[PDB]
Structure 1
Amino acid sequence: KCNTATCATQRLANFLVHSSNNFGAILSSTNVGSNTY
């Protein structure tokens, strides 16, 4: 199981990309962090 919420979003995005080859849109995954203290 995932210990963090970031693990879960990564698994979800990976599954969406790796299951949508025959889907009607190109899915492109990128990450956004705060870059703050």
Structure 2
Amino acid sequence: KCNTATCATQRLANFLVHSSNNFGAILSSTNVGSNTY
């Protein structure tokens, strides 16, 4: 794993590259057992 601006950004890029595993799967929060808390 990485957490630097040079790498986490790449991880970010992979989060939004297709997003097929994240795209309001995690971020929407309303869909994770309704937890926007």
Give TM-score scaled by structure 2 length. Answer: 0.36
The list of structure 1 runs, each at least 4 consecutive aligned residues, that deviate by more than 3 angstroms after superposition, is 20-37
Q: Percent identity?
A: 100
Compare CA radii of gyration and give the structure with the larger one. 1
Comparing both structures, which one devotes a greater share of its residues to strand?
1
| Contact 1:2/1:8 (<8 A) preserved | yes
Q: Which structure carries more relative contact order (alpha carbon 8 Å, separation 6+)?
A: 1
Give TM-score scaled by structure 1 length. Answer: 0.36
Unpaired runs of 5+ in structure 1? none
The superposition leaves residues 7-37 of structure 1 with CA deviations (integer Å, 9 ceiling, x where unpaired) of: 1100001110121699899999999999999
Q: What is the number of residues matched between the two proteins?
A: 37
